[PDB]
Design a protein around this ligand. Sequence first.
Ligand SMILES: Cc1ccncc1NC(=O)Cc1cccc(C2CC2)c1
Ligand SMILES: Cc1ccncc1NC(=O)Cc1cccc(C2CC2)c1
Lengths: 304, 304
Amino acid sequence: SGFRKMAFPSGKVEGCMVQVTCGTTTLNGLWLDDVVYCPRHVICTSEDMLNPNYEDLLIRKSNHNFLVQAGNVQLRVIGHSMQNCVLKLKVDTANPKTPKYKFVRIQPGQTFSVLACYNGSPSGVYQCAMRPNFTIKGSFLNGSCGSVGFNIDYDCVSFCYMHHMELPTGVHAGTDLEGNFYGPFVDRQTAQAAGTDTTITVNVLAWLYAAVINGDRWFLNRFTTTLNDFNLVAMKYNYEPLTQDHVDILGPLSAQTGIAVLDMCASLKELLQNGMNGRTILGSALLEDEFTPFDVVRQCSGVT
Amino acid sequence: SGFRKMAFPSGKVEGCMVQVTCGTTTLNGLWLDDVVYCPRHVICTSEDMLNPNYEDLLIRKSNHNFLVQAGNVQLRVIGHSMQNCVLKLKVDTANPKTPKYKFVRIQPGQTFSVLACYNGSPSGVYQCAMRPNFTIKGSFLNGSCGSVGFNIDYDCVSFCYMHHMELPTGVHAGTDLEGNFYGPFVDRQTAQAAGTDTTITVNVLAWLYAAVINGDRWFLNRFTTTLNDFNLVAMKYNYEPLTQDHVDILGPLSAQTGIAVLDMCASLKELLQNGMNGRTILGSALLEDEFTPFDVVRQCSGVT
Ligand SMILES: Cc1ccncc1NC(=O)Cc1cccc(C2CC2)c1
Ligand SMILES: Cc1ccncc1NC(=O)Cc1cccc(C2CC2)c1
């Protein structure tokens, strides 16, 4: 009973968080095996940030300039390299708390948990989605850079995000664990406006299926629609076009509830056209799009 | 930048979760020092649940009937006792992962994180509030009993909730770690309807302060009100009466933003009377009440 914006248990990731300081900048690093990963902008001063030449800035840095502290103990840095927008600091000690892990580059619409950290210490955990414009709507303050996003499958942590910056619009941009930014963003204090933040239609449908499973059924109607008819409405409301791949991914939810995907699309179409009329769905007055069909099945089945 | 429903990092609590089985019932237990705490209804069969005599049921149970497994290893049970609605299973081994901890009984309106578990394994973490009718709006399935709610202050975990049941209305009831239920609920499969779920006014104001700090200011108006005038409106909308204690607790947020508490109450009064007019605040189309003033300061300052 009930449906919540649930994050993965953060313990396996908390055991990897370290503090990295270079000069006067301190941010978070991720310690896995004998490597600490962190945003390369740790080498910048606020003055460098306007147009930094990372290769030139990195030449003036030696292994001893990177101070890495895991809890209250200092790690010895024996190597450093830049991979895209991340620094890889080789340390002389493998993290004994290293979980089974993978680095994955997620697709827009996919969800993940964030362990927000400051000075290598965890502050909180929340669930995010990679928006269709490649930003995330997080909760990060100065010092949060290097905090990571991840998913967990039983005992394997899949790291998908590392926090790098806030755009002037208060939205967040970062990289995968290979240092490649999601979207067109650059690690520079410059004019970077985000594109249209469209709604993740397949996620909204998944959440309507979660609502039906949990008893919130007022929005079920007597109608059906087609993928092309539904997409005409989705375009008008800045919703992502729904594909047959999306319909297929909603198959288990359609099977569990007995509500055909296209019938649920017709409920969604009427919700878009008429609004909620002051009503709520799963305690929300808007259509929630940060639950994937996998998340809904996971939460509704109790996967650990 | 940004404001999220954030839970505490769950690692310290994940290290305490164990599985407890008695007969054919399996639920979660909390292992702290050499004691495992779990709901006493672990001793019941579904047939017992209608009107169980826990003292009589417990007489037929010996230490060897309580199977406690921490990960893949079995704990030896050397003692058992019932304290209100919880069982305390004394084991022969202190949990080596026991964090600094306290048991606290929270007040309605206070928030906490829940680590939902099944078979002693963590599934997810989310943030809850103890409702004014002493229920929680969680996300729990069969097997989730014994999952716990907690707050963390630097290194000390304050355990405040242990999950016991779902009411016929899909809301959740449970106890503090002394086994006393929050509210009038009993651990019996019987007619237990919840009272009025009023809105936690002081939390809504805290969240409006969070919105102002994060740039969402459209709802600020040219008005002020009084505590008595505001409470007349709060009563009409099933909001909890605001006291001078609540005004005092909002003091740091009022100081940070320069918006007097009573002016923010007047913004809230107009939001209640006129609605959102299809607009949003911090990505929500309703007034959020599960952030305390402490939570807002914590998130907006980056406490770890
Ligand atoms: C202040 C804050 C709040 C939330 N999240 C992150 C931050 N910090 C920054 O964005 C720091 C910064 C400042 C200008 C540019 C850059 C680019 C190299 C990435 C980085
Ligand atoms: C099925 C489920 C879903 C979510 N949360 C909890 C549960 N389980 C129960 O409520 C089990 C149960 C069933 C009747 C009565 C009792 C009372 C002794 C507490 C307990």
